[PDB]
Each structure stands twice: as C-alpha cells, then as structure tokens.
Design a protein around this ligand. Sequence first.
Ligand SMILES: CSc1nc(N)nc(-c2ccccc2Cl)n1
Length: 215
Amino acid sequence: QPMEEEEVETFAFQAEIAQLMSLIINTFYSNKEIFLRELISNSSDALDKIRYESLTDPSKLDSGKELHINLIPNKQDRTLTIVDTGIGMTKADLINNLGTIAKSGTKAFMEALQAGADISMIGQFGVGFYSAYLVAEKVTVITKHNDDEQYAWESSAGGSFTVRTDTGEPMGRGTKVILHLKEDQTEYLEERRIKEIVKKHSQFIGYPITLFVEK
Ligand SMILES: CSc1nc(N)nc(-c2ccccc2Cl)n1
C-alpha cells in the first residue's frame, strides 16, 4: 500500500498526576483488584450522564439505546477490556480529563497512600482511573461522544500520553478501556476471578454487565 500519514498528539501529564502514576507503578500494594470497581464506577457514571441527558433529548440515543457494560478478557493478547455505551468523551474532554488538567484530589491522595492508606481509597479522591496502573503496564482508552469523532488515548506512563483519531473499530457511543496487563497480573483474565471481584465490589451499579468468555 502507498505510505499513509497519521497525526499523533503527545502530551505531558500534569506533574502531580505523573507523580501519582509513578507511585502506583513502582510500589507494591495489596488489594489491586479494586481497579475493576473503579473502571466499572466510571462506566456507570458515564451511563448515568447519557441516561439523564436523553430524558430531555431522546435523539442523544440515536447512537444507541442500550445502556450497558461489557467485560472482555483476551488471554491471547493479555488484555482486559471494559466497554460501555455511556456519554463518551470529546477530544477536548479526553485531553483534559485524562492527564493534562490538575485533579483536585491528587496531592491529598498521595499523602494518604504514603501514610499507609489502602489503595482502595483512590476512588474517593476522584483519581480512580489511575488504579488501572496497578495491573496494567499500558492503558488504551477509545472514546466516542455524540459531539465528536472517535479518539484513542494511550499511555505506558513515563510522563506522557498520546491522542489520535482512532483508526480502529468505530463504536456508536461510549468508552472502551483496554488494559494491557502486566505479566504477573493474568488472574484478571480468568472468568471465575472476574466474577468474584464484580460480586464483591460492583453489585449495585445500575446497568447490566456481561462477561464475554472465550471458548
Ligand atoms: C466521560 S465518559 C467516561 N467514561 C468512562 N468509562 N470513563 C471515563 C473516565 C473518567 C475519568 C478518568 C478516565 C476515564 Cl476513561 N469517562
């Protein structure tokens, strides 16, 4: 094929977010399983946003009426994908919300964690997404909002992330978080383990979850 050209935007994480990511990555924490509760909570919040906004404007569901979460472990590529049909993010929302803008709870959470707080407290500080780095060496976030095109965000930490127009499979609306798991964290690809953690932490979320198991 003749050479194709793709635009990439590389961003630096806000200094404190980068400090938090390094703390989560480079330090042992027990109870890493809470990463799933945090991502399912973000999906649930996104599904509430489109649900309430569609009450006033039902055409916001032209990109899909079904409001749900799918969990997709892939043992071949060692990824766990969390997909929702929530509100999604515009490119601007994605750049702002996933690393460039200082988050209110970052400083406070780092002090709490170092003082011996369990990693489980992360969600209360509004930085729960970053718990993905307890189990993943790389995270890819694919998102589609009614007001913009589909975008792919990705980071292996190291203080930067990239954003590009997604060349992958289009989604009607919502967000897909792809966790590229660390070699020692493959238990999160096991259906019994995923079911255990969803029953323990994610029972009252408001939307149906479906776990897709590879035969
Ligand atoms: C606003 S739509 C949305 N959907 C999901 N699943 N997650 C998020 C989110 C919120 C904060 C930080 C990172 C993400 Cl990916 N945002």
